[PDB]
């Protein structure tokens, strides 16, 4: 997260690690046994760290848990990046808690201007490589869908939003992909890509989770 400020511990207790020997990427607990990342995100030997604040120092509250499953959409398409999502089923249930909780599918879909909350592990310099310890945070708004073609000429779909600042400065970057974009108290979003980090002009694109609603239950259902 780059122009962002640190969250305090555990205030964003949805908020996950994907985890491989190091921390490559975020993701949101929906519910005890199962969490949504992005598709590119996906690699196996996952271990899902929940209750994390500083991701290199255990200082408790911390349950890590390996993935049984992951289902990357069948429709994913890993040159456009439309449709990335993927759904985690933990090998066993987290206990939850004020310091681990899940967070809700939306019922609609937001509109431009809402103001959402970003999170994640990701680097904090839009020039060069600086990953914090703890968990970074950025509040920022949904952009209305003319800007963000606009910024994206033919690469934006209807599974897709932008949120951000077209002044650049503040944006989520590598490192947060997978993470959740809450809007009030429902995840709308999963950050995916964007041009660089905080770039004039070339704000974050998220996943639609609204586009999504059924699908996922539908398929935690039968799995
Ligand atoms: N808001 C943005 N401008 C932005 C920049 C990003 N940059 C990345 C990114 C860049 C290089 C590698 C990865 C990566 C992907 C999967 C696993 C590990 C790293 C990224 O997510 N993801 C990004 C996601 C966003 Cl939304
Ligand atoms: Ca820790």
Known sequence: IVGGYTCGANTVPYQVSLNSGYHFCGGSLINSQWVVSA??????????????????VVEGNEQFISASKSIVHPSYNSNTLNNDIMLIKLKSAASLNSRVASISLPTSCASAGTQCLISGWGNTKSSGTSYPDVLKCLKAPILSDSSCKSAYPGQITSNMFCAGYLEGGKDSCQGDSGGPVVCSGKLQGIVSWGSGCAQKNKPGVYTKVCNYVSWIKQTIASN
């Open 39 to 56: 598709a590119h995100c996906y690699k196996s030997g996952i271990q899902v760290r929940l209750g994390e604040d500083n991701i290199n």
